[PDB]
Amino acid sequence: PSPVFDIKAVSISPTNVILTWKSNDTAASEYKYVVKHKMENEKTITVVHQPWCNITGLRPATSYVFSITPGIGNETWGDPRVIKVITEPIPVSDLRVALTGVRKAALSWSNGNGTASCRMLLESIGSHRLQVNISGLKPGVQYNINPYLLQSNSRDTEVLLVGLEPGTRYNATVYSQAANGTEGQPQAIEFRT
């Protein structure tokens, strides 16, 4: 009847996540547990002998609520423990780059429904060098920044990177962020001037 604990949700996709937990607290290890979904309009009640569950068929940018309750026999139920789980936005799609003239590189992508903002990470590759972290992109807007300046201190995204130095190879690594403050999986692209 002892509550669950060290609860953790391994995110495999923006559509399914694996909840894995522990219980013990005396009585060795031989119990049964019940999980509850609240994805509204329908209430789902999953019961698993093992201390882990596969929750599938979820929405990317939305957060669901789950409750885990350990049981032993029948009415022999224990206590409820509740977790709030946010899933990943769909990663940025149509990731593209188009360099215009040796010191300038334009890179375009299409965000997706769930995304509210993007986080780009720009790095040079090979130099006796930068690694800037362009936080807070927006969908549908057009940006244009010299990233080397920042070192010293429809629904698409249009970002031109100027002031680039020839002969050096760059990576752009773009992550999709949601209003709930949770990053999706990254999408990278390379270009060299």
Contacts to Pt ion by CB under 5 A: 37, 44
| CB nearer to Pt ion: pick between 7 and 106 | 7
Q: How far is the CB of 46 from Pt ion (least distance, A)?
A: 8
Give the closest residue to 70 by CA, choosing from 51, 53, 88: 51
| CB nearer to Pt ion: pick between 36 and 103 | 36
Question: What are the φ/ψ torsions at residue 56 (nearest 5 degrees)?
Answer: -130, 165
| CB nearer to Pt ion: pick between 44 and 113 | 44
Closest chain position to Pt ion (CB): 37
H helix count then E strand count, the chain: 1, 15
Q: How far is the CB of 174 from Pt ion (least distance, A)?
A: 30
Q: How far is the CB of 56 from Pt ion (least distance, A)?
A: 7
| CB nearer to Pt ion: pick between 67 and 93 | 67
| CB nearer to Pt ion: pick between 17 and 118 | 17
Question: What are the φ/ψ torsions at residue 78 (nearest 5 degrees)?
Answer: -105, -130
The residues facing 119 across adjacent strands are 135, 175
What amino acid is encoded at 105 in this protein? A
Element (H or E) spanning 48, and its range?
strand 44-48
Longest dimension (CA), the chain: 72
Q: How far is the CB of 41 from Pt ion (least distance, A)?
A: 11
Q: How far is the CB of 39 from Pt ion (least distance, A)?
A: 5
